[PDB]
């Protein structure tokens, strides 16, 4: 009894367990998850790797350790009696078999609900998903697999890559991650919109001059390079996060909370939006600054693990519209970039101007701002009699900060909020089979087309906002930008 | 034109009844806070007129008043009284008007001066004062204004005659009258908020909201001068002026422009479709003393010796009107005021209606909008979010924003402070209009006859309390729902 | 409902022996009588510079209009009631016996009178100054209609209506404009604020603008020379459409009183801005050759008017309220004489419908109001093809008042208003500050026009008018559509 | 081609053809849309049934012959070279086996697409489907059959029928009808929502005050009583054609014309439709009229073929609701009956008073109407200053009559445009596997009450509107009527 709307054995297997993915987050997170006692009674970790690592509490103690409590010491021993390891290549069946049996060697492992987390590199998915399906699977009970990376580089190829696991495992049994979906405020974006009236006729076009979805980072390529030039910020970033963050603003009002209703509300926006057009894109590359220090002096040619001559975009700012009578016209902002000036991810609302103006254009548009991170915080700036022996107006905004309202409450993890949800079988902040096709449908023309006549992105600087052509693209589809606005704490 | 912050024409501030509580208490510092604060034109004269024979500006002036003063102020201090001077006479022989007006031309400049007269008296004088002003005082260039402080008489008769004796002399745009509420910042802060945000347009309806709060509370009862009181009845004494006013800029329609005029007419507008309030709809309740308290807590109403002995006067009233239009026709507006509550507190609240077409299992509580004018001037919407942390279904929250932390700096202004610069700027769109006055009577005086008539007896309340429980199950049956499911933290 | 039941009143015309009085105001004057709308004791008294006979004598050989034969009886009836007086328009002696000759009647000192003006707006100054003087009944009204409150000039129209206002009251000031008083313009207040149906499409939300149509097919039948004076503006817009846009714009009244109308219209006036050079499309007609009669005499081969006159028969204006409501939308007066022609129209198009899933096959809505001929209002809509068709195509919900309500009689516009200034309703006339707005908005362009005295655009006889106009309305926003089939 | 977005050989096989439905409405439809020359080139007609028929031309020109024209004699003829006769039993393979060869021995028999309308009693249904996709089956082209009453009657009995066709048949196969969405003015109703802004922002629960679809019948059980008795008006009309009309009246605007994204707009209006409440439920039976003629004077029970004490309703309004942001808290009133006093199909709004009356109360709710048959109409009743001498309004309306403004074009039968349907493919105008679902499930609960407590139903004479009963629970549920609306031509 836990799960917000009796007890078995679970197993929870860590495939690539030796990963830097594993040992930095699944491992941890799955710790703090037993830690507030959020996971059933009868539950065993079992990590699985290529390498033969030293025991189920001295390798997997001494590379995990993220956040250690000096008091938690008993429940910590605790729980790495629940540990155990097995090592195994991820392709002969023969390794596979020798889990299996231990996995029914644990306490009732023939009984237990086997949940299968993939922290491992895409290629070796074709091929795990296979041996799990034929010796791995349990007789009794529920399987289930989460799948890290739910993206290839190319359609016709993750159609592939897709369709085969497909092939073995049903959909109710297919939880494709995307771990923005599991971070606070992305989450109450629905309660928000679906359980207030003052947002409610106010949420079309009618009302809405355009929507922005900002995505920033502050560090550039930390020296990995190498590995991100293969798929370039639209599909490491835009492509996945961005667009579910759309799906979650744009949506219609679904038949209910169920997962299977919302999904559909989502994918029914998707399936408005017109393939992008590379007239309403911006592409950009940072280049290392010189006045900075450490990696803010190094661009992003300077990393070694990068081919010396790549055109790849560390910035992207596009244009998308939804075709239906709600959002008809109003054009959607997704910018996103590496080595900027900051950090933060927030969704922005400006509305259009007051009809039939009276205050002799001294106003400014309305804004909703629903900042995800960091410091999760909602505000609306508006208009209010300048404060004082005054009579014109200037702008103030209504205000709900998380840190002060709620200093108490600590925000759970992304991971620990999802993992929960597999537990209790909620596929409502996965994504569905569906929902990936038609993100392909949108950007593969453009991505297509960009790798063909391979574009020069615009040069910038380590730690600006980014290509001036990116702003002057907003302002040019709709958005007004006031340096006009004061704010204190 | 210019924002009123820039006037170098000679300008003379005549305080009428200069010895007045009134005139020491709160005249005749704003006066100076406004000269402090550099907001008064550089050629302003003050000239304190009364029936005492009374000791020039630095004498029986000075001493009486002196309300905030601070120490490295002393020489703009001085500077002030060089501007201020005295004249004594009575408020009705031509004689006393006539060197009034002397002493006024006596001034550098006095004949082509803009003059402007605050009425700091009683009522009653107000007929021959006026009449007096209009032909001996009148300045020959420069404008007259003339400042009302008691709009509102004992009688429907009594105030209307008066009114019409005014009006005969001067004109309309000459007549400032007072209602102080219009000038305290939140109040004002009304119009801009809804009329210069898209976030709070599409909203303000019928089809949104279900009803409105207009609220005022003093903790203290009647401190001991009970038997003034006894004579107006919280009715005429807050909510047929400072509630109403509330009303109308919380429901007037948008104005041509922000010209006093424009606005005035959306306001009276409003009142012309509200029909005479029902005695059906009405609360009253007088206050007890509390035996458990302390000082004045423990003397009720009747325990005043000034009160007689067997009065039926409200303390306490509620009441609903009806705005019948197109925006308005069925959402109740409901006025509530007290003496001797729980706390002290001014506020405009809107309740929205359930959101349509429920999806969490009625787990959502209507949303609200809080204009809080005083204390710690704030406004805030009551709304629903995401219950924090590894929850799922939803919790009350708000958006807020209030004056002291956003704007720890800027000092607000008194009420009396805007207003009177209003009259020196010459914007009368604070002040209420003759056809403003009239419409307010027109509402309340069925009501208040038949309570003189049946005399009926008031429901007591202890003092301090939050008043009759009859209140609030008035409240409920007329369409508000409350739930004490909210936390607030700071 | 027409519900002191009956008093005596005098129906007083002064300037009787007018075009207007023969050919308007004797005849309405007459079949109010004859529907018993009048009240019993009723007395017509002409009044004019000339003494034509008594009254059965030569008032019954000029008017005549609309007799029929078993009427005789009334008919003989009503002239028992009518009487004449002759006199100069500025003399006290002549006034003088006009009064004793009221208090003659039966009970002439006690009844109400009602003084209509059916003479040149110069006399005006005079007749309103003795009628003060000399006229004024002691027991009961007095109300004045004024047949034309617009003048010439800006500063003679002002000066005009000031005099007026120091001697009567605006409750005595009847001023005209029998637009207001047409079947269809009335019932433009019923149509929108007593249905739900219109309610919350009228708006900047829905409307992409607002046409208001005045088209005459005949030009100026030889009198060009007194046109020429004031021109197509002055003559139909700045009166009588601006008056339809008031009533198709104003915010919903408080109730409906005669003012609290009048407040909602004047309103919308103070929020238009002065007429900007740019969206005026001027035009002059030439006559045509294939044509036959008038129809080939244009405009200059007129007699009557200057030789080089640029004075316009036809204008199309654009205008915009700046408030909440029609913040944006355009406004399209047009107007003018010697067209294809005679209508007076309402028309409202709408935006296209957001998400179409029609693939563009769908065109825009539009509610029309035709004040006149055969009074109508009717909406434009989409609806499937019928019979074995997917595809949608243009249709209407129409309401033709001739076949609806074939028996009753629509009233002519007079009549309704003379009725008005019995019964004391404002309501259907000009306010002062209404024509102190409509001056405010037209002086600028007027006066610019005659400065710079520009040519206005040729457009033959019989045609729709300059193509520059329609090119203006499209510019604007309007979008027509030649594809719309129309059957009876 | 007729549709937008050639001459394969076409069978149009009857099931059935000796039918009643068949000779009176099947094979005529079938030859009206040979006649307009509708059909492909190459189509042939084969009539099938159980008794040994003489040949096509003998026997089957002898039964049909419904809308005959004098100089048409010439295609008349042409038609019947088309059309071929198959006699056997609806069970045995022989009997099929035969068929199939005789198609085949048809020009092209192997390569034609091949239709099935079943016209014939819902209890052979799972023999028929049975043999047809065994022996039956067109190698190449398209098979699609066409099931009269897809409504069985109990929920159980009629899933259990739905499920063995649905595991021989694939969804884009079956054709299931209900002839009322085929009807002009029924089709209509799409494009006058979702094609105008007149009526776009008043389609509303701000606005609308109630709906109300009816259906009447001027005539009773015309002798047949027998048949009727096992269904009851409720399970005859207003589970299927009614709730279609309000699916069509109340759904969300489709992302497309396409047959299924419609579908699932329909559907989705159903799932939010609570259990109907035997509170809001109305039942009456006819009882013959003293003074009337002929079949007049016998009531329901008068009717031999019908148990002499039976309760079945030949009579029922309805109250539903629709839990959604749209319609949340406006009543649906379902009102039908047979033996009244006309015979209309008709959709109605009435619409809320205007907010703040400054008319005194005179004015009167509007109402939009749209009337199915007879006489095809759609108008809007509405408030006009009264013409003349008048300040006051009265009521009048904007209309559009289709016998006067199309006074040319002749409107199809529903069974012409339907089957057309089906030659082109789309399924718009059919119901689809879920639809049904969803009907029974609102029903049953009531339809099984009902035949439990046998209620006896209020009696009402033949001829007149019905119970007042009815009319009391419209006004109790928000439905205001006022007698006072004038109408002439
Ligand atoms: N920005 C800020 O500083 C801030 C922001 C949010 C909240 N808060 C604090 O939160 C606390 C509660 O917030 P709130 O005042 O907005 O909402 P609330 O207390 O839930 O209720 C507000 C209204 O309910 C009335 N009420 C209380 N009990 C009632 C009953 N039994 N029957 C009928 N009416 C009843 C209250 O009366 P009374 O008026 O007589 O009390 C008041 O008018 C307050 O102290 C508020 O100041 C402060």
Same mark, same amino acid.
């Given at each position: 009894?836990?799960?917000?709307?009796?007890?078995?054995?679970?197993?929870?297997?860590?495939?690539?367990?030796?990963?830097?993915?594993?040992?930095?987050?699944?491992?941890?997170?799955?710790?703090?998850?037993?830690?507030?006692?959020?996971?059933?009674?009868?539950?065993?970790?079992?990590?699985?790797?290529?390498?033969?690592?030293?025991?189920?509490?001295?390798?997997?103690?001494?590379?995990?350790?993220?956040?250690?409590?000096?008091?938690?010491?008993?429940?910590?021993?605790?729980?790495?009696?629940?540990?155990?390891?097995?090592?195994?290549?991820?392709? $002969?069946?023969? !390794?596979?078999? +020798? =889990?299996?049996? *231990?996995?029914?060697? %644990?306490?009732?492992?023939? /009984?237990?609900? @086997?949940?299968?987390?993939?922290?491992?590199?895409?290629?070796?998915?074709?091929?795990?998903?296979?041996?799990?399906?034929?010796?791995?699977?349990?007789?009794?009970?529920?399987?289930?697999?989460?799948?890290?990376?739910?993206?290839?580089? $190319?359609?016709? !190829?993750?159609? +592939? =890559?897709?369709? *085969?696991?497909?092939? %073995?495992?049903?959909?109710? /049994?297919?939880? @494709?991650?995307?771990?923005?979906?599991?971070?606070?405020?992305?989450?109450?974006?629905?309660?928000?919109?679906?359980?207030?009236?003052?947002?409610?006729?106010?949420?079309?076009?009618?009302?809405?001059?355009?929507?922005?979805?900002?995505?920033?980072?502050?560090?550039?390529?930390?020296?990995?390079?190498?590995?991100?030039?293969?798929?370039?910020?639209?599909?490491?970033?835009?492509?996945?996060?961005?667009?579910?963050?759309?799906?979650?603003?744009?949506?219609?009002?679904?038949?209910?909370?169920?997962?299977?209703?919302?999904?559909?509300?989502?994918?029914?926006?998707?399936?408005?939006?017109?393939?992008?057009?590379?007239?309403?894109?911006?592409?950009?590359?940072?280049?290392?600054?010189?006045?900075?220090?450490?990696?803010?002096?190094?661009?992003?040619?300077?990393?070694?693990?990068?081919?010396?001559?790549?055109?790849?975009?560390?910035?992207?700012?596009?244009?998308?519209?939804?075709?239906?009578?709600?959002?008809?016209?109003?054009?959607?902002?997704?910018?996103?970039?590496?080595?900027?000036?900051?950090?933060?991810?927030?969704?922005?609302?400006?509305?259009?101007?007051?009809?039939?103006?009276?205050?002799?254009?001294?106003?400014?548009?309305?804004?909703?701002?629903?900042?995800?991170?960091?410091?999760?915080?909602?505000?609306?700036?508006?208009?209010?009699?300048?404060?004082?022996?005054?009579?014109?107006?200037?702008?103030?905004?209504?205000?709900?900060?998380?840190?002060?309202?709620?200093?108490?409450?600590?925000?759970?993890?992304?991971?620990?909020?999802?993992?929960?949800?597999?537990?209790?079988?909620?596929?409502?902040?996965?994504?569905?089979?569906?929902?990936?096709?038609?993100?392909?449908?949108?950007?593969?023309?453009?991505?297509?087309?960009?790798?063909?006549?391979?574009?020069?992105?615009?040069?910038?600087?380590?730690?600006?906002?980014?290509?001036?052509?990116?702003?002057?693209?907003?302002?040019?589809?709709?958005?007004?930008?006031?340096?006009?606005?004061?704010?204190?704490?």
């Amino acid at each position: 009894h836990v799960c917000g709307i009796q007890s078995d054995t679970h197993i929870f297997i860590i495939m690539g367990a030796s990963g830097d993915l594993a040992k930095k987050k699944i491992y941890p997170t799955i710790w703090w998850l037993f830690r507030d006692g959020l996971l059933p009674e009868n539950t065993f970790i079992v990590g699985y790797a290529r390498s033969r690592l030293t025991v189920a509490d001295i390798r997997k103690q001494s590379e995990p350790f993220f956040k250690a409590t000096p008091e938690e010491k008993l429940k910590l021993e605790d729980f790495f009696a629940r540990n155990s390891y097995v090592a195994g290549q991820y392709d $002969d069946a023969a !390794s596979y078999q +020798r =889990l299996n049996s *231990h996995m029914n060697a %644990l306490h009732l492992g023939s /009984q237990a609900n @086997r949940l299968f987390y993939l922290a491992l590199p895409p290629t070796v998915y074709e091929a795990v998903t296979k041996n799990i399906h034929e010796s791995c699977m349990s007789q009794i009970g529920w399987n289930r697999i989460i799948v890290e990376k739910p993206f290839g580089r $190319d359609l016709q !190829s993750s159609d +592939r =890559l897709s369709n *085969h696991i497909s092939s %073995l495992f049903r959909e109710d /049994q297919i939880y @494709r991650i995307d771990h923005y979906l599991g971070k606070e405020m992305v989450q109450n974006l629905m309660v928000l919109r679906f359980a207030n009236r003052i947002f409610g006729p106010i949420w079309n076009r009618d009302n809405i001059a355009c929507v922005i979805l900002t995505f920033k980072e502050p560090f550039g390529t930390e020296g990995r390079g190498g590995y991100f030039d293969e798929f370039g910020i639209i599909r490491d970033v835009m492509q996945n996060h961005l667009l579910q963050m759309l799906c979650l603003v744009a949506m219609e009002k679904p038949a209910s909370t169920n997962s299977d209703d919302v999904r559909d509300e989502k994918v029914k926006v998707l399936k408005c939006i017109s393939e992008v057009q590379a007239n309403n894109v911006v592409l950009g590359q940072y280049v290392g600054n010189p006045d900075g220090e450490g990696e803010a002096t190094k661009g992003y040619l300077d990393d070694p693990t990068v081919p010396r001559g790549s055109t790849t975009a560390t910035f992207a700012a596009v244009v998308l519209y939804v075709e239906n009578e709600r959002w008809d016209g109003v054009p959607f902002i997704l910018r996103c970039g590496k080595a900027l000036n900051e950090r933060k991810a927030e969704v922005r609302l400006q509305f259009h101007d007051v009809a039939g103006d009276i205050f002799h254009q001294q106003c400014k548009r309305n804004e909703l701002v629903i900042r995800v991170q960091p410091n999760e915080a909602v505000y609306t700036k508006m208009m209010t009699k300048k404060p004082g022996m005054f009579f014109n107006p200037e702008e103030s905004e209504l205000d709900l900060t998380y840190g002060n309202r709620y200093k108490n409450v600590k925000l759970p993890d992304a991971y620990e909020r999802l993992i929960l949800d597999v537990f209790c079988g909620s596929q409502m902040h996965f994504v569905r089979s569906d929902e990936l096709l038609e993100a392909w449908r949108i950007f593969t023309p453009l991505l297509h087309q960009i790798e063909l006549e391979k574009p020069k992105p615009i040069p910038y600087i380590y730690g600006s906002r980014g290509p001036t052509e990116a702003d002057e693209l907003m302002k040019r589809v709709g958005f007004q930008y006031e340096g006009t606005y004061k704010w204190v704490n």
